[PDB]
Amino acid sequence: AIKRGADLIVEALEEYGTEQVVGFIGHTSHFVADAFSKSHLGKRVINPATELGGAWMVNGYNYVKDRSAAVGAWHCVGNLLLHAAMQEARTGRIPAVHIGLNSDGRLAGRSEAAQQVPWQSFTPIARSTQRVERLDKVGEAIHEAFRVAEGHPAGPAYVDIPFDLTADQIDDKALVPRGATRAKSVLHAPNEDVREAAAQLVAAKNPVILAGGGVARSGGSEALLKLAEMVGVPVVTTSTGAGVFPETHALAMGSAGFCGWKSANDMMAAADFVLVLGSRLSDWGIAQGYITKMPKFVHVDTDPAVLGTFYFPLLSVVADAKTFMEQLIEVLPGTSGFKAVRYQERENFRQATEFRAAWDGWVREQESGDGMPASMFRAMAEVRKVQRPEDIIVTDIGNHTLPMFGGAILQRPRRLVTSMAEGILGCGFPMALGAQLAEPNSRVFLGTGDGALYYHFNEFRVAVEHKLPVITMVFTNESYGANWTLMNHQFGQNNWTEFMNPDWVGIAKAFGAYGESVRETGDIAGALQRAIDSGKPALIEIPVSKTQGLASDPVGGVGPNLLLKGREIPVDTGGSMYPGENLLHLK
Amino acid sequence: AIKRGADLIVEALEEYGTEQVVGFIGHTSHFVADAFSKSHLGKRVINPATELGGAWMVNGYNYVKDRSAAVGAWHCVGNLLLHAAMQEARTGRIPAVHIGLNSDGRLAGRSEAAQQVPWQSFTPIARSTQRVERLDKVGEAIHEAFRVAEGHPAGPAYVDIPFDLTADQIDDKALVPRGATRAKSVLHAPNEDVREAAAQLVAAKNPVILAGGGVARSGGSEALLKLAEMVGVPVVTTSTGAGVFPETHALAMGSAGFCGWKSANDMMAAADFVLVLGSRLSDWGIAQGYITKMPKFVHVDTDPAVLGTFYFPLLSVVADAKTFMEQLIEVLPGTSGFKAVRYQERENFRQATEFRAAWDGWVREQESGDGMPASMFRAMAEVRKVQRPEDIIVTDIGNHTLPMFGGAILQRPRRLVTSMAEGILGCGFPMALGAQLAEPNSRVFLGTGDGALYYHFNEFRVAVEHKLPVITMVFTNESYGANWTLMNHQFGQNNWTEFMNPDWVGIAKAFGAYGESVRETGDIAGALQRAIDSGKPALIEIPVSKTQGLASDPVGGVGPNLLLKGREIPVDTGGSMYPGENLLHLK
Amino acid sequence: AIKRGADLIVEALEEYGTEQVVGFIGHTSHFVADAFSKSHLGKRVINPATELGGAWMVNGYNYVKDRSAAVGAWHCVGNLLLHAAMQEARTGRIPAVHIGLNSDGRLAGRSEAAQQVPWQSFTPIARSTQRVERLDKVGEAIHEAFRVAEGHPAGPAYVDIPFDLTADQIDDKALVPRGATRAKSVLHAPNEDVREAAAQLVAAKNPVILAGGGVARSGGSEALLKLAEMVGVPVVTTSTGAGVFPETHALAMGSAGFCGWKSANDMMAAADFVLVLGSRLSDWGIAQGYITKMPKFVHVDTDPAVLGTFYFPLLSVVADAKTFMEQLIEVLPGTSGFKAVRYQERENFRQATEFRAAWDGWVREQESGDGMPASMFRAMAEVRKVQRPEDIIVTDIGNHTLPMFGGAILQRPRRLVTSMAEGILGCGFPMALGAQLAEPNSRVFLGTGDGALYYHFNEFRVAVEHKLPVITMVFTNESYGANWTLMNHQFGQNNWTEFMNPDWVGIAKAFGAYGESVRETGDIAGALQRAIDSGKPALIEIPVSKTQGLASDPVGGVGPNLLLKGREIPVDTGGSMYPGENLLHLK
Ligand SMILES: Cc1cc2nc3c(=O)[nH]c(=O)nc-3n(C[C@H](O)[C@H](O)[C@H](O)COP(=O)(O)OP(=O)(O)OC[C@H]3O[C@@H](n4cnc5c(N)ncnc54)[C@H](O)[C@@H]3O)c2cc1C
Ligand SMILES: Cc1cc2nc3c(=O)[nH]c(=O)nc-3n(C[C@H](O)[C@H](O)[C@H](O)COP(=O)(O)OP(=O)(O)OC[C@H]3O[C@@H](n4cnc5c(N)ncnc54)[C@H](O)[C@@H]3O)c2cc1C
Ligand SMILES: Cc1cc2nc3c(=O)[nH]c(=O)nc-3n(C[C@H](O)[C@H](O)[C@H](O)COP(=O)(O)OP(=O)(O)OC[C@H]3O[C@@H](n4cnc5c(N)ncnc54)[C@H](O)[C@@H]3O)c2cc1C
Ligand SMILES: Cc1ncc(C[n+]2csc(CCOP(=O)(O)OP(=O)(O)O)c2C)c(N)n1
Ligand SMILES: Cc1ncc(C[n+]2csc(CCOP(=O)(O)OP(=O)(O)O)c2C)c(N)n1
Ligand SMILES: Cc1ncc(C[n+]2csc(CCOP(=O)(O)OP(=O)(O)O)c2C)c(N)n1
Ligand SMILES: [Cl-]
Ligand SMILES: [Cl-]
Ligand SMILES: [Cl-]
Ligand SMILES: [Mg+2]
Ligand SMILES: [Mg+2]
Ligand SMILES: [Mg+2]
């Protein structure tokens, strides 16, 4: 059948499992938008206030789904706004396909052409960058994009299509590849390696299991619970793994790292052996700026590139996390020295429970005291009273990240969302909208700084039109508070940190969202109830200090090195000069 | 003397003429912010709501200054938001230096590193991209950046500096290059080329002088007035040249092009010879999608690359525009066939005056729409009543661009501002703030669509804190009106074009800006008076139709070909298959 | 201890298993060469006539070793010659680390600098490209290079180090990472998948096992022999897999593809099921220009990227080839319908033996006839009389490739060497020298075209000095014979194909190599004996036809499409013009 390139693009997106399109109109995307209006997918399209806001929605949706279920489709120059969100998708392992409709291929390369997008700008960012030259390659290019995006590692794929090809027509026989294939992901470890891990767990006096985001991607919660109880070993997570182990369990230490729980950092410092499952031991994660000292450890991952790049394990294993845990459960009875004992009776139990109890007591101290300014830990204690296991916690980047992570107590995977890998400010609100679109049965609670909310609050138009009832707490301190705090310490003076806020209640109301301030009332609990009952997106203005959180609260961190110290560097030797130095010797 | 890298950066920026810093804080920019606080540039640093908003401010400031007077200084991952504004600076010939402070060079290249910015993403966009490896190269790199940015062609330079080098210290002897000078820019044409151009001008029956943005950069307004009056030749401009010739003059036809004045398009269609001065004859400028038919023409530019790339001149000349005009003025009396006659008595005068009268009559007809919705041409007629010769007109991108360009009547150069080269939506409000910073005592009037204002209205924070009294008219139609209208024409249906507005007056009030709607009154005149009286940034909501402007108003354009018609393309031949086609051959 | 960067580079190369250095001197590699002279590795350095010749030696060495045992070390501008060999290493899956010593980092970025190598030229070619900015990163960068080079997929890594860092000194504590870690590669398939493969083999009426180069990397020869005999299934290879199954066995069909054995192409055309092990089903391999029709197939590979990119399998499996075969051997007794029967008694045996017998008879016909010009198949029959199982066959690219592949009958893996993935002319002689260096106990026989030998015969100085007794047959036809033959057919006329040869015997003798021509004697057998007995590198000049081989001999191929047919393409529509077309409408 004769088909337009635009129709073929939409067919290919349908073929590879697309559910949610985030699209922006312009003449180069006109044919694609018309094709979508005639398709199943057209029913769900989101048109964001800006392309970067929309790209953040794609990231939030796909982070919680672990596949490229959301896709971007963008008119030429709007692709120029994608880079920040695309970078997070790369290092944060978020599958995400973006289709850019460039200007006419006839005009490409002319020096005075308008809107000829430099697609090569994405080469260092996307895991796959393709410029489509020919109409008969559109299906093929989209097929490749999904294959790369949904691999190990997951990440973004960008496809640049000059828009004349979307208007052009061709016979469609076999053009869109049908019935795309996939190998099982349940990669099994060699039995020798499973035996070695079991022997190390037995021998250890105070072992820990460290579960990262790969346990979530693997679907390994059930196996992890069975394993941890069988051996009686405390469980630490990364921030993307939090919730794969119920965080109310006696063996739950929480997340290690600089915005994590002190119980987890205490356990990592005490442990004589770690079993690492599905973690990349990253800079702003377990490595803490490449300062953390790891105990001897076994490292199990599906991506060989993460194994041994920086921390050299005792034993490295390429395997699926769930599968490896199941193999270990089978081998343990039978391992020399293993005995079945209730975890509460193991010799290492008291230590771990003491670490957790000390952390819980400190958290309760931070929750104490009503009135203003509010403690962000108290705000999260109020959320917990109305929070269900399926509900999602979102944060932005700042002082506030630490209380959001410390007050999030999670029972299911993929319930904690931010720009994890790159710490890109402004992510929180649009990622929360993407997560809400993906998980319509979840309540989504966002704790955002004021400096953060400034970026993409224009997306309230999406939240209101599409009935996405995110509950946003905007923590106001009229500052980039992490930076105020750190610069005061570093230099004795903050600079570039202070700003004015609008009346955020008035902003919300101007969009038809629910708005309430607790500046005068302190009534966080009531505001949450009213926000929830409204059925609207909501904004609750909560004054906080400039200093509470990341830059100040002690959680047992060792890094990263935000307050780097300079070194005195020698000048160059040899006779070569600086530019312009000729004039100093005589002109 | 031993100095920190951050201090050396500030010294280099001061040496090369920086007047205004737009900066965003984070740990990687802490030392640079601290160093700026010790400089006279500190007192008035602009900290924008987002880095892309700030990069648009840099563009607006530098467009009106014709040098890199404003500079950007950005914490690592915030650099990822620069690309759209940087692309406009490249093709739009806006000098602009951006300093990106990357993460620690010690950590660069580690696969699980956080915030290691891919500076190579700028290579296809900036005119100069440099990664500084060594502290002793910081002065040298900044010297190079200004050299490239302020050359011919002008454009953006990006300098990536790992922030450890900003904390490190070194002896400073000769390190910052001092006393840089440029060659004079007053390039003279060969006398024979001047004589040939004079002979063509005098021989032509219906000549035109086409003056582009290069006449503004050259400072050629006085020479252009003398030349046009001496020979009695109508003047057409590009949109960046508008205002170099007073647009109230009898010989002023206005700007040619698809959002220009019909008088100019009429004149270009009638002309038998064109003298092109300081224009690149671009796609969305004079070329109109490479459809415009140029008469025989002489082409004078400082950049050899624009001469003969697409339109082949009768004679190409490398020269400064002002200088070439002065040369021509000198040779005209000695040119056979030249006679000194008042311009009003030349044979070609009546034709040109008829074209201008017909255009002016059409514009007047558009000023009497006079209901709700209001006419955008009426809004500009009201602006003109309170507009001085030094005041600046800004627009965004949409249906509204055409009435903004058509209602702008200018007497001085560099008074019309937008994303000229790339048409990037959202530019208008932050570019207007940048222009206002550059010229504190000029009045700045912005006409913006609603879809456009959605992008960067977060920068009201800057406008209110810094008391930048930009007068913004938001034209409301609850749509991307150009797209609504044109899709209805192309397909019989529009898709992706409609959205809800907030209460824009309420948004302004929530920020502390002046806000008023004329929906019930039509009182644009009174709203402008009250907005000006306020002394604040102002937002005036003006309801408009979905269709008025670019999509519906004929101005004699021929292109560009954006509603392109597809072609039927043959399938490939030979035996090669599509991916997945193997399955189709199984029996 | 205080160490120079040069000393640290050599320590790191030793740490990660380097055996063979191929290095080229110049001031930027002076410190590195001095450091090598004080190391174990210095004893084995090869200094090639050119850097591209040396890079081909690295490829030949590492192709046969399956690890980056050979490394390149190059003075600045000599790195500019690496790209061709580096590209083969990428697509041909050859591990290969190259260390480039650039010019002084102080001078980098200066516009009029000499010998500042553009290392970014390698970004699209190497699997890893690193520019080292800091002395304390030299060990780290080299560690990363080996990790990427020796992964799945294997490939080249390039490290660019400004040479000042090689002269600079630093305390060495912990700087070179010690005890680099690695996971086992014996990846096991899910038992369900092994069961499915067994069920498909049972059900099939005339199955085939297709073994590629991954079976060689895996070390799977023993398992493949046991499997093939147990099920009684014919074995086809790719050209990099040839020799993993003894090619004198009754079940050996040889290599499929356009330069392969007709018995293998016949079997692939007849088969109702294929088990593909360790093949990427490549363009100039099994795909034959994406024309080959695959029967339903199971595809087993360690690299998920090759699985389903173009040919969609019935079942895709991520597993090590040897391991998967061992799993299959265990499950087969017990699979419904499996019965133990001698392979000679299976119903499918006669068909396969008939295909092999027909091919062998055709090969014997091509060997018949002595005298001149010689048949290249007869030359290979003469080699076979003096060829041991450990010996290596090398070819270059041309008509001659087909008889080299068809006359190579191999019993062990990694005995067939060329530029497999990219077909880069000239590879053969230097790859043969690299293979000889790696396998000093092998006799190495090269069959090279004359056009090919012209490239790197300058490397005879290496062969003679280092006593590398490669036996080279130069097939003379005074032509690029593949192109003469194909162009005569395509156009009726050859162009750019003919050239003169030197007296190749005189060339060999001028280098101190053994030289002999059979132009007058026809005595191939005697020349081989004399060449072998000389103990020198040898060159035997053998006249051949312009036409025999790739471009003419029928081996059952279907592609690739060398003689592509053009299509008539429509002109563009719309009014836009070509550059310069303005002058045709009136100037
Ligand atoms: C301000 C801020 C503060 C932060 N604070 C912390 C903190 O305190 N603690 C913290 O941990 N992080 C923190 N982060 C997040 C951190 O930067 C990283 O994003 C995070 O630690 C990475 O998690 P991960 O190691 O589990 O790997 P992920 O990025 O989640 O990647 C998944 C890993 O699992 C592997 N994998 C995927 N699927 C499977 C499978 N089926 N089986 C096996 N392996 C699989 C992948 O190959 C990869 O190695 C912070 C971020 C910011 C911006
Ligand atoms: C929605 C939209 C509608 C538009 N409609 C129009 C329209 O109707 N008409 C129109 O003209 N544009 C229009 N534009 C703008 C257009 O895209 C270009 O930005 C503009 O036409 C370029 O102007 P220019 O040719 O004068 O060159 P500029 O981009 O202003 O560049 C300056 C030129 O002068 C040269 N130069 C610089 N200094 C000197 C010197 N000292 N002496 C000599 N030469 C010098 C430079 O080398 C260069 O060639 C539109 C843009 C948009 C987004
Ligand atoms: C002139 C010319 C003619 C040619 N003619 C032919 C021809 O007739 N026939 C032919 O076959 N080729 C031919 N070639 C070579 C061809 O271009 C390819 O180089 C070759 O076919 C690729 O072999 P392969 O598919 O086995 O994969 P390789 O390139 O050998 O790659 C190895 C594959 O095995 C996988 N792998 C690696 N280790 C393991 C492991 N442990 N377990 C499982 N999988 C593993 C890899 O991921 C990869 O998919 C020709 C080349 C030229 C230049
Ligand atoms: C795009 C971007 N720009 C700047 C930063 C630097 N940064 C990190 S945290 C932070 C403070 C954010 O302020 P806010 O959201 O108010 O949070 P607070 O620190 O006050 O809790 C900043 C500016 C960043 N990470 N990303
Ligand atoms: C970043 C970006 N995204 C999308 C577009 C495509 N575009 C061009 S004009 C336009 C309409 C803008 O709407 P508005 O500002 O309301 O103006 P109107 O057409 O209603 O006058 C759009 C979406 C663009 N040029 N840039
Ligand atoms: C670098 C390079 N240049 C050119 C070619 C194209 N090419 C492929 S085969 C061939 C013929 C080589 O001639 P020769 O070595 O004499 O072999 P013959 O065809 O005569 O057997 C040529 C020119 C190539 N593959 N690589
Ligand atoms: Cl547009
Ligand atoms: Cl940050
Ligand atoms: Cl040299
Ligand atoms: Mg804040
Ligand atoms: Mg609008
Ligand atoms: Mg030849």
Side-chain angles (χ1 to χ4, degrees), chain C residues 151-168:
Chain C
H152 288 254
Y158 179 75
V159 185
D160 196 75
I161 306 177
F163 87 116
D164 52 302
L165 303 181
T166 77
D168 287 345

Coordinates of all heavy atoms in Angstrom, one line a residue, chain C residues 151-168:
Chain C
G151 N 36.5 -6.7 25.6 CA 35.1 -7.0 25.9 C 34.4 -7.8 24.8 O 35.0 -8.4 23.9
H152 N 33.1 -7.8 24.9 CA 32.1 -8.4 23.9 C 31.2 -7.3 23.5 O 30.2 -7.0 24.3 CB 31.4 -9.6 24.5 CG 32.2 -10.8 24.7 ND1 32.1 -11.9 23.8 CD2 33.2 -11.1 25.6 CE1 33.0 -12.9 24.2 NE2 33.7 -12.4 25.3
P153 N 31.3 -6.7 22.3 CA 32.3 -7.0 21.3 C 33.7 -6.6 21.5 O 33.9 -5.6 22.2 CB 31.7 -6.2 20.1 CG 31.1 -5.1 20.7 CD 30.5 -5.6 21.9
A154 N 34.7 -7.3 21.0 CA 36.1 -6.9 21.1 C 36.3 -5.8 20.1 O 35.5 -5.6 19.1 CB 37.0 -8.0 20.8
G155 N 37.4 -5.0 20.2 CA 37.7 -3.9 19.3 C 38.8 -3.1 19.7 O 39.5 -3.4 20.7
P156 N 39.1 -2.0 19.0 CA 40.2 -1.1 19.2 C 39.9 -0.1 20.2 O 38.8 0.5 20.3 CB 40.5 -0.5 17.8 CG 39.1 -0.5 17.2 CD 38.4 -1.7 17.7
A157 N 40.9 0.3 21.0 CA 40.9 1.5 21.9 C 42.1 2.3 21.6 O 43.2 1.8 21.5 CB 41.0 1.0 23.4
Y158 N 41.9 3.7 21.6 CA 42.9 4.6 21.3 C 43.0 5.6 22.5 O 42.0 6.1 23.0 CB 42.6 5.4 20.0 CG 43.6 6.5 19.7 CD1 44.9 6.2 19.1 CD2 43.4 7.8 20.0 CE1 45.8 7.1 18.9 CE2 44.3 8.8 19.7 CZ 45.6 8.4 19.2 OH 46.6 9.4 19.0
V159 N 44.3 5.8 23.0 CA 44.6 6.6 24.1 C 45.6 7.7 23.6 O 46.7 7.4 23.2 CB 45.2 5.9 25.3 CG1 45.4 6.8 26.4 CG2 44.4 4.6 25.7
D160 N 45.2 9.0 23.7 CA 46.0 10.1 23.2 C 46.6 10.8 24.4 O 45.9 11.2 25.3 CB 45.1 11.1 22.4 CG 45.9 12.1 21.6 OD1 46.4 11.6 20.5 OD2 46.0 13.2 21.9
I161 N 47.9 10.8 24.5 CA 48.6 11.4 25.7 C 49.6 12.5 25.2 O 50.6 12.2 24.5 CB 49.4 10.3 26.4 CG1 48.5 9.1 26.7 CG2 50.1 10.8 27.7 CD1 49.2 7.9 27.4
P162 N 49.4 13.7 25.5 CA 50.3 14.8 25.2 C 51.7 14.5 25.8 O 51.8 14.1 27.0 CB 49.7 16.1 25.7 CG 48.8 15.7 26.8 CD 48.2 14.3 26.3
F163 N 52.8 14.6 25.0 CA 54.0 13.9 25.4 C 54.7 14.6 26.5 O 55.6 14.0 27.2 CB 55.0 13.7 24.2 CG 55.9 14.8 23.9 CD1 57.3 14.7 24.0 CD2 55.4 16.0 23.3 CE1 58.2 15.7 23.6 CE2 56.3 17.0 23.0 CZ 57.7 16.9 23.1
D164 N 54.4 15.9 26.8 CA 55.0 16.5 28.0 C 54.6 15.6 29.3 O 55.5 15.6 30.2 CB 54.4 17.9 28.2 CG 52.9 18.1 28.1 OD1 52.4 17.6 27.0 OD2 52.3 18.5 29.1
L165 N 53.5 15.0 29.3 CA 53.1 14.2 30.4 C 54.0 12.9 30.5 O 54.2 12.3 31.6 CB 51.7 13.7 30.4 CG 50.6 14.8 30.3 CD1 49.2 14.2 30.2 CD2 50.7 15.8 31.4
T166 N 54.6 12.5 29.4 CA 55.5 11.4 29.4 C 56.9 11.7 30.0 O 57.6 10.8 30.5 CB 55.6 10.7 28.1 OG1 56.5 11.4 27.2 CG2 54.3 10.4 27.4
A167 N 57.3 13.0 29.9 CA 58.5 13.5 30.5 C 58.3 13.9 32.0 O 59.3 13.8 32.8 CB 59.0 14.7 29.7
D168 N 57.1 14.4 32.3 CA 56.8 14.8 33.7 C 56.9 13.7 34.7 O 56.9 12.5 34.3 CB 55.4 15.4 33.7 CG 55.3 16.8 33.1 OD1 56.3 17.5 32.9 OD2 54.1 17.2 32.9

